[PDB]
Amino acid sequence: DILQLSYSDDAKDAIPLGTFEIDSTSDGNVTVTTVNIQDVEVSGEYCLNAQIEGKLDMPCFSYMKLRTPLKYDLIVDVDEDNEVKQVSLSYDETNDAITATVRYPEAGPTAPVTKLK
Amino acid sequence: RRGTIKGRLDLAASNITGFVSTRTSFKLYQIGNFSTEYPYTSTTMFQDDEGNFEFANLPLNDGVNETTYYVMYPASMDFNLKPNRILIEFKNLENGTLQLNAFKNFFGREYFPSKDILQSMKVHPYHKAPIRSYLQARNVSI
Amino acid sequence: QINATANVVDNKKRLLFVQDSSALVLGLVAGFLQIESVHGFIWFLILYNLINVIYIVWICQLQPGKFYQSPLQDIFFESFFREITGFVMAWTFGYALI
Amino acid sequence: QEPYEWAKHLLDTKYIEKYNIQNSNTLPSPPGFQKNQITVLQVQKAWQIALQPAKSIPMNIFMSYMSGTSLQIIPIMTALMLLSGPIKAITQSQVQTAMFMYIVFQGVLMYIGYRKLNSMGLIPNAKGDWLPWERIAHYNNGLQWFSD
Amino acid sequence: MLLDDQLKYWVLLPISIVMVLTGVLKQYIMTLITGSSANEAQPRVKLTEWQYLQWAQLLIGNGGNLSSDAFAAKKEFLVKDLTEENMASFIPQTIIMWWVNHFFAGFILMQLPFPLTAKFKEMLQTGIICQDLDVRWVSSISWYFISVLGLNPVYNLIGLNDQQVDKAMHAMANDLTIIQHETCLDNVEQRVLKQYM
Amino acid sequence: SFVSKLLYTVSALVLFHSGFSSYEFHHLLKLNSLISKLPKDIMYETYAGLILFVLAVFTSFEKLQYLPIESNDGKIISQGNYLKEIALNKATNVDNLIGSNPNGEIIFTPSFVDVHMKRKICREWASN
Amino acid sequence: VFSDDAFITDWQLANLGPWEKVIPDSRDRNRVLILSNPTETSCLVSSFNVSSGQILFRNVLPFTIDEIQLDSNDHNAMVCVNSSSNHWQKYDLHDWFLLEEGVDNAPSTTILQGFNKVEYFHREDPLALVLNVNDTQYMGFSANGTELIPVWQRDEWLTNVVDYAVLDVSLWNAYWLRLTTNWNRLINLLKENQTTVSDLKFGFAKILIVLTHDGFIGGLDMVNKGQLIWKLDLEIDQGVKMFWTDKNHDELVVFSHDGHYLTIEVTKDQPIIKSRSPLSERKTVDSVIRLNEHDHQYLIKFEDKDHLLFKLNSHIFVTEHDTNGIYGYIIENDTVKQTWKKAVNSKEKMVAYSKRETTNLNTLGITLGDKSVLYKYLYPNLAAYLIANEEHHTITFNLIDTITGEILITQEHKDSPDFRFPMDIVFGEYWVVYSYFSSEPVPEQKLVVVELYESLTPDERLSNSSDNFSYDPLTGHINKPQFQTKQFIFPEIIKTMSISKTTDDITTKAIVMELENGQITYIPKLLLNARGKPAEEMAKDKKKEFMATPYTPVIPINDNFIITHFRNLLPGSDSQLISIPTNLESTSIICDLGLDVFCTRITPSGQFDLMSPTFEKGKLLITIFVLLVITYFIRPSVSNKKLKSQWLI
Amino acid sequence: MLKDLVREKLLTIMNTKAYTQFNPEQLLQLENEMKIYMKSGDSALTEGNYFFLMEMLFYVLVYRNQDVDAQVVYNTLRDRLGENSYKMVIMKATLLQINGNDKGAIEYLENLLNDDLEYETDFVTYVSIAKKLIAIKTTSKNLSQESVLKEVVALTDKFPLDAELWWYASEIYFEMGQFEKACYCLEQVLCITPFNYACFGRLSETLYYEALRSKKQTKTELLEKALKNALRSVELSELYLKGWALVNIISRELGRNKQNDLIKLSASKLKEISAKSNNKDKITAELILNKI
């Protein structure tokens, strides 16, 4: 559905950083689109939340020293059945905002055993 | 309904009668489109001083001309063994019987050929017989 | 200049004795002191050429031209790679033995 | 002592007049009693240019049969000799061209030895040689991390 | 890195002792085998013809000692009498290299006092496939390679001296006829006056 | 010479003692690392052994002295050199000072010696 | 390299538990059958010499003490009936031959001085009396001579080892002092003339300070055969962790499951408990994490998921794994505040975890054949873990940042895996090796290697090592890893894995794997090559390193690398496989505490720091004396041939 | 280090063969010093130098009529080397020559040269045995100098480049008035040994004798050649007494005097030789300088 990314302090409530839209297989993959970004001055060590109001709640997925030019990358690690497994916040120098990218997990290696010729 | 796998690791047929029975184990792992949650895994030991192990009460795929496969691992901390793995076919025929076949295989080779092709695996009779109980020789002389 | 080649060969033999003993014992002392790379090679250059200067002053008696034809090529060159390999050999021997 | 006998007979000029001559009739006598510039130019041309062939494809195939491994010191030492020997060894208007050609092809043999040492990998060009003297990214710099 | 001292005392000195003894043996074998000298064992007439050839060669080389009136006569008489009348050293190195790589392979012998590049890790460490060993910690074949270069001072200090006919005669007469006589007796007086005054 | 062998043995003893002391120090430092480099008495003893070895090498050169060939007395000919002069003007000064001839196997005719004449002259000298 | 070291360089404390029931063997009467080590799902049944004190065999049976009984029609056979599923198995008592078994019908089965002794055991009337003397000590007396001499002795205090600890056991006046001392030493040497020492030098002599589940502390000597130097009963319930206090290794802090910490001063001979104080909120300690050894504080985690920063005599991040998720914590000044959680869903389970081990850095990267460096991802604060998904049946390898807690690398294995088999992660300097079990290529055991580099293109270092730059990983501004992965088969099922720790971490890290049959092998990291091309493609293309191993995705079990040579080693289900760095870089101590403490010394790159025991000194001196004899005999021939050259020619 | 000085003195008397020209008093002192040295330390003296000094000791004992001790020395050298080298052949020929048996020594050397014609060893062996044969034929047969010259000329026709033969030929030619043949033989020795400054001095002496014997206009023409050869003899040896004495005498005889830049240099060099050289050279240089 809609993933609300929101930073927060230790005991106080959350402060929203953005809302992104997970769309399950329009024509291709489940890759995100950005609905709303938040131009809020944020600086310091904060707990980031990635709450989806329908499917998945994350009380805190990352603890980052956020700066006001938030040059981050919301990596949404997804599954085979296109459900949000994990959310993480990567750093990206050429980003200028918080853009959300869906990450599919890499196929693990398979060993080339001997075949029946 | 449930199949039984016999076997015989002949240790008295090579004058290795002085041994510990618990250092040789026989593992069984189900493959080939089972119908349970987990595949069936068993591990037995010897039954007699002759060396005749036996797996029993194995769950099978109930259906006409339907197969259920088992990889048998005869392992021993004392001796090397000649068939490293044994594929077990448990085909429920329309014959009214339950055909048990066994195929030799070594470690590091697939058990079924590709659907495009084929080379077959060497058939095992039935008890079965892991031959060649020559010692494992851990110690390197220097 | 017409040279007497037996005297040339004998003077080069005495100079080779000095340079061989000096290179081997400089390697032994650079191994006893546990000297590393650049300090060891600069040590060998300084003390080996100082031993050559003491050879020109004391043995050649401030005139190595009557004892060596081309004295700069004979005393400071023509055994330089030989004595630096002997220094490296005795240097590795003393550095490994300490 | 008394002086030498050659000098007692050298000062008196009357002794040589007294010194008579023996008759010599059957007395036995002892036994016995430009193109040079062009050949010199050809000999010097063989001294400066016919040494070049050794530095030619014979030496190229001789260095091509060593396979470029460091596992022996004979190819490395012969390549150091190919480096240092040409370095140690470096009608008037005809031999200057061969004199320049000699040191030029000695430099060519030096480049052949350099090509051998570079194909061995024994020359510090790439970053695998200057890797031990390469510093570390100090990642923490004021934090500590401990795990369960 | 804590190495074994017995590795030093049983690899450094035995390899050096075996290498100086095989240098002594190579010098002794190459003296005993090479029995030839500057002269050979020939019959008398071959020695006489070679002596006349070498007489023409010595006249070419030492005509400067004579005057013109004697060099001309000797040249005429010599013309009238001439016209009318590699792997043996690398086999012990291969044997000693194999003996080092057979008796002493499998352990790091010592540390060099100078660092080299990483490519020398492919030659100075043999029985050790460890990749984090820098090229200072070396095997015994490195001590062979170092001792091969550096034993010439030790070889010197122990006292070892450190490791058809008519066509040729007519060619020597042709080289004798075209020579330019440049005697050293022409201006010997001014040379003596320059040297001793 | 005597001073050369004395300084050779003294430098050998000093270098052996200093090498053993440096071995003890560097193999006690390896046990204490499981900073504090060489104490300067061992360094100065290695330098003393090196200086004494260099003096033993350079005092092995004795000045070239020669006995005269003809005369037999208490006179020894010395040019005051440690090495032999290479120039043939000055190389043969040794041969002219002592009374020899370097091509004496040609000049003196040692193959055509009348042996009976030498024996006659020596017998007549011993009889007189 | 092995036959002179078997049962010599290694040792095993073949332990039972406390002997719950002892059953005499009717076929021998010199053997006995002990039920011991009673867990809630298993029991150790062993056959044991009552005249020699040695265990003949051991078997961890899946039946409890109450379920295991004796057959009525055959007293030389035991019937074990799991009554929760009616599964019965009949075993012979002599050679442990598995007799009849089934699910339907179980057979009719019956039921089963010293210094302050507490119990009798095996009262056999000819001989072989056993006295359970202490609570966990068993002595055995025979009567050869009608005097009851002590024959064997056994101390089963070491059953379920939790933690451990390893105890390693002006100028002229100086010149004249040196000269006089060396003069007196040479005088004493020339007047005197007219292993257990090298093990102290090489660091082999160590003391294992094993902490058991009952609350005991031991002193197992490493260079002995596991000889108990000293023992101490802490009279606590379920000791949890054990750390040194200071860097000089003189005192331990043993925490317990009731919330008590004990400071125990460890001397050379015997330790005394010095403090037995409780904690602040003492309910149930789960695990303790030691932080910043120079400033002695700890992170005591409770069973109620609570935390306590504890202290005795800028930021600090602590990650903590559980069966469901991995959590982060920061220590600001003295408080423990949680920072992130990589929790799992209802169908997933964290099955393996390993922090990145703080290895000593020797090389910044891997030099290839073109001398082009592939730089290692040497960023610390990494943790690798496995997520088992039973809904999709997948193995998800994840690599987390543990400061910000972002998943750097994810890897799915849809290899139809089995979660009833052991799975383990070990983390090297720049690589992860994780073992699981699956059946899609073949039904054998899988080993996946993930090597992390800064970039996969050579000579492309992405880390800023400049002097005017300092990384701040709490911002997330660190370089990201690029990985290379391979999967290998393995014939035996791996129970647990470890990395061999050496002194400066120079020699190749051996992934030491304890297998499910009790055997312990090790695979070197050179043999697990993640940038492996096969032997066809390895010889042609030259971009590999010097003697780079190819990709062999089979890994046959090398019997030379089985370091439990012919030993009936039985680690339990806890069974921590630990490695101890000594001196003498090539070797490392591998111990296998948890039911039987086995310890050995392995050399993954060969023993290059030490002279071999079968080093040919005799042929060496023979060759030296032969060269001396040949030179001394051929020298007068040369001295005569040079004289003949001087005279004849 | 007197042993090293006596060793180098005995090696210079051995190599330059000065014992050939020694007095009986000098041969007695030489035999005494040689038997004192050779019955002593023997540390720096090599083996080949020891047997060369023992050959020299044999010839000193032969010249001093000590034929029994010479037979002992030859027996020791035969026990080491045997009668196979050329030097042992010459020693056997001398031992045959002094024990009567001159025709026996002639027969031995002639039959050996008939063995030393085909498939011979090197040229030094043949020329040394043949020169000893010429010496024994000179002593025994009482040959005139014409016949000795015929044998030496036959030994230079075949086998040239033996400067000993040409020097002996020049010696016999200088004993006669045949100065031109002597000068030809000396110029041949200069061709063989180029740096033989004693041969340049002897050539200058023969040309000076021929110039004084001529007494004509060719006297100055020969004194020019004599002065040039005497100046070449001192360009090869600074302290050569014979060369500087010949430079002085030939310069005074040529016409130049009153310190004409070469008589001054020759007088200074003869004063230097009288200052530093040995007593024979000093007395001879004072004889040269203080004439007239």
Ligand SMILES: *[C@@H]1O[C@H](CO)[C@@H](O)[C@H](O)[C@H]1NC(C)=O
């Ligand atoms: C998969 O299942 C089918 C029956 O549904 C069976 O025939 C087949 O053998 C199975 N595959 C394998 C590899 O056994």
Ligand SMILES: *[C@@H]1O[C@H](CO)[C@@H](O)[C@H](O)[C@H]1NC(C)=O
């Ligand atoms: C027997 O097996 C074949 C293929 O395995 C299948 O096509 C056939 O339907 C089976 N027979 C019956 C009666 O099911």
Ligand SMILES: *[C@@H]1O[C@H](CO)[C@@H](O)[C@H](O)[C@H]1NC(C)=O
């Ligand atoms: C089953 O098949 C086997 C051979 O395949 C045959 O011998 C047997 O008689 C069959 N069973 C029946 C009941 O016919």
Ligand SMILES: *[C@@H]1O[C@H](CO)[C@@H](O)[C@H](O)[C@H]1NC(C)=O
């Ligand atoms: C009895 O069997 C069940 C399933 O077979 C198993 O879960 C249980 O743990 C067994 N009982 C014991 C005591 O191990």
Ligand SMILES: *[C@@H]1O[C@H](CO)[C@@H](O)[C@H](O)[C@H]1NC(C)=O
């Ligand atoms: C130990 O057991 C073996 C076999 O069970 C037996 O042969 C041996 O005698 C026993 N030891 C003693 C000391 O009785």
Ligand SMILES: *[C@@H]1O[C@H](CO)[C@@H](O)[C@H](O)[C@H]1NC(C)=O
């Ligand atoms: C039993 O334990 C006590 C410790 O309280 C010890 O002193 C005693 O020696 C032990 N018994 C034996 C037989 O070792």
